[PDB]
Amino acid sequence: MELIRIAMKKDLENDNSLMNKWATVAGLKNPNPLYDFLNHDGKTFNEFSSIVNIVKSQYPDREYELMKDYCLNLDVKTKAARSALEYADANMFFEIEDALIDSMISCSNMKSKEYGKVYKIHRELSKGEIDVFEASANIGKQRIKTAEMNIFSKMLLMYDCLNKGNFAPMMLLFQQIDLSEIKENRYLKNSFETRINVLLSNIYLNENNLELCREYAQKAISSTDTQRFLVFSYLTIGTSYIFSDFNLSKQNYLIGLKFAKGNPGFEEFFKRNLSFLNNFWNKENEWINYDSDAVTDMQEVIFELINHKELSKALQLLNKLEERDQNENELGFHYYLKGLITNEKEAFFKSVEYFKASQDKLSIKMPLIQLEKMGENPRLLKIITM
Amino acid sequence: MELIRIAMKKDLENDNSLMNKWATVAGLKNPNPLYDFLNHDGKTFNEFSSIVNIVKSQYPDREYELMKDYCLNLDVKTKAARSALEYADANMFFEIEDALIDSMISCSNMKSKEYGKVYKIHRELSKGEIDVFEASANIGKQRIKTAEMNIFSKMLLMYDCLNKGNFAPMMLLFQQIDLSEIKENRYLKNSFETRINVLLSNIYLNENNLELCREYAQKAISSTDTQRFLVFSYLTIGTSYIFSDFNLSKQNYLIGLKFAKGNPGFEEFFKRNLSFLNNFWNKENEWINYDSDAVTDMQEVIFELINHKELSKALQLLNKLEERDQNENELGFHYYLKGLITNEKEAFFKSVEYFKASQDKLSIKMPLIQLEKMGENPRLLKIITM
DNA sequence: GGCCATCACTAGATGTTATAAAAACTTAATATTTAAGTGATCAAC
DNA sequence: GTTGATCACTTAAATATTAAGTTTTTATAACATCTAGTGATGGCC
């Protein structure tokens, strides 16, 4: 018997009003399906949200271990298990996802075989075990029946397009999606609407189109309770405001930090961004990590020194970092800081060049603003960012 | 009976030494296969070059009519017909190609079905009836057996990559090709070596990498006597020299013009390029078309006027052209000419902008050289071409 | 006496399975055709 | 008497086709599982 059913049975023995409340949360008109859920082994709900809404409302602090145990006990032949796969992948619960894919490939149900295979392609592609042509070929081979995996196979490609910065082909795949084809599984339809909106959000930020980027980040947030999509949407909104509005930047970053509670990985994104936002706007900065070997953290300590007019100590530390292997996007920030200390145009030109080589359409604005103040042709500096 | 066999039979009745000479040209160690070719209906050669070499050596002035008739009378179920398809496509003989594909799709031979289908994908893709994901999926679906169409399906994608200026994925597909897999059909292996060398040549010219571009254009020329590959290789070498070496530019264009004799379409590429080369280097220009409505021809008459210091007549004509819908690459050249007449930096800035928007990494050098003379920071101008 | 949890029936819309029908797919085993030898046969000279 | 065009043998390697033994689609049909109603039964107040 699944931990979720044990914990619901224990709680209902105490507070006998819970079933009508669980129905409301599960979107059920009456709780007969929930009595059937607690009473009869391997009962499932038509829509996987019935179970997720409840695990979320009622046992939030144990969502992983509960949904793991429930997902890893499901009939892989069933719509529930195809939904579990989307929930697994959307939250980046790989142990669960890979396990559900394994079972669904070698299973007897044609829908669950399809979903299982297409998710394997998405997994292999995102990990870097295959390129987009291999992937797009494995899709073609699969002879996809369902509107669901027709849409999702286009989306798994949109993710690889997003990794390579490639707007034109992403939008080409996006034009071909009509989510109103998804009729069987409304959990997927809604989870895919969140994915598309997050995707559009990240490609528009990358194409340095800030107003659309927020429009789509907000649609994503309206439409979801999934931690991963909330964290990234607020990060994307936070970054959309770095140069235009310090409070909206800080506000969206802090909201995203709340939603990342107990995922140090997700929390560091916000801490590092808030570190940079505050140093950039010359504010007291509580987010610095004075203990970190990481080039990015050592840069923010240098940037604070520069803001505190400790130019000689900043230059001593920057020249120690030159002795050290840095990627191009790091050297972009290096020469920008060497620029702020020395007021040498050459440093800013290298900063612009390194950001240009790293395909960073956002950081490049930093050394370009300094070059416009030092009197370089604005019309030329604009041409560099096109 | 095929026209090629009629005309070979007629000529041999006159000069009875021809068979041993035709064998040498056909790469045959003795002419028994050629007696079998003339004597017995539907005899074919192991390698389609045996027949092409001869039609080329012996009846050059009627190569289309002869090879059409021979190709469109072949057993589509045979290696010859799969070779005819490559020869059809390589020379852009679409009437023949599409006809051979039609017959090979609905035929009973597994190899000739495969080749027939893969060429349809290449045709649909190049024409713009499908995008690269559709194509890459149709390949995946086809369950390709043969090393030949494994390599060719990668190549048909490299053509779409080339159209969209996408170096990274082109080279990714290229890394995966090993032509030493082709064991059955040495005609395809050699024809594909020419295609990939031409492909590499055009992508490197586009990435403004001129020495590699020539290296590959030259390998292509070594490896072939196909008009279309010769024409484009010499055009590519011609263009590779436009800014660096006027004589090598003019020389390679003129060689390519000889090889284009009697294809007005191919000849216009050379005439228009020689028109521009001569105007650019301020030489007497015989190639101008004073009669043409075409924006690019009217630009070269303006450019000659500018070289002859008839600036007021040049400005009158340029201002007529503004009244007129032009693509971005045309407006790039427009503002460059408006620049040369008026000495207005704004015109050169627009020229740089329009070349940048049209992804023309070669023409952009033109307005950039003017901006460097007018005193603009060369270190900044270099960053624009990164 | 009324309300409210419980929960098995129930109707009907939906989702799953299973069970032959018809296609596409290996495979291996002949069967054709190929280049290039060998050797008449007639012409030439 | 020699030569060299002609051509059908030939052999042995390579290309092709047929066949029949496996998977794989398919579809129309026959069965389970859903949600949300209905109604029972029993605490509770």
Author numbering:
A (entry chain A), B (entry chain B): 1 to 386
The authors write:
The arbitrium system is employed by phages of the SPbeta family to communicate with their progeny during infection to decide either to follow the lytic or the lysogenic cycle. The system is controlled by a peptide, AimP, that binds to the regulator AimR, inhibiting its DNA-binding activity and expression of aimX. AimR is a transcription factor that in its apo peptide-free form promotes aimX expression. In this study, we deepen our understanding of the system by solving the structure of an additional AimR that shows chimerical characteristics with the SPβ receptor.
In order to validate our proposed mechanism of action, we solved the crystal structure of AimRKat in complex with a 45 bp DNA fragment (AimRKat-DNA) which includes the aimX-boxKat with the two 6 bp inverted repeats recognised by DBD domain (identical to the ones recognised by AimRSPβ) and a 25 bp spacer. AimRKat-DNA crystals belong to space group P21 and diffracted to a resolution of 2.5 Å. The AimRKat-DNA asymmetric unit contains two AimR molecules arranged as a dimer and one duplex aimX-boxKat molecule. Overall, the structure is similar to AimRSPβ-DNA (RMSD ~2.1 Å), however, RMSD differences are not constant throughout the entire molecule. RMSD differences are minimal in the N-terminal part, which is bound to the DNA, and increase towards the C-terminal domain. As could be anticipated from the sequence identity between AimRKat and AimRSPβ (almost 100% for DBD, TPR1 and TPR2) and the identical inverted repeats in their target DNA boxes, both proteins bind to DNA using equivalent interactions. The α3 helix from DBD inserts into DNA major groove allowing specific DNA readout by side chains from residues N30, N32 and Y35 that interact with the T6C7A8/A36G37T38 portion from the ATCACT inverted repeat of aimX-boxKat. In addition, DNA binding is stabilised by an extensive indirect readout of the DNA backbone at both the inverted repeats and the spacer region. Meanwhile residues located in TPRN-ter are involved in the 25 bp spacer binding by mainly polar interactions. The high A-T content in the 25 bp spacer allows a small DNA bending of around 20° towards AimR interacting surface.
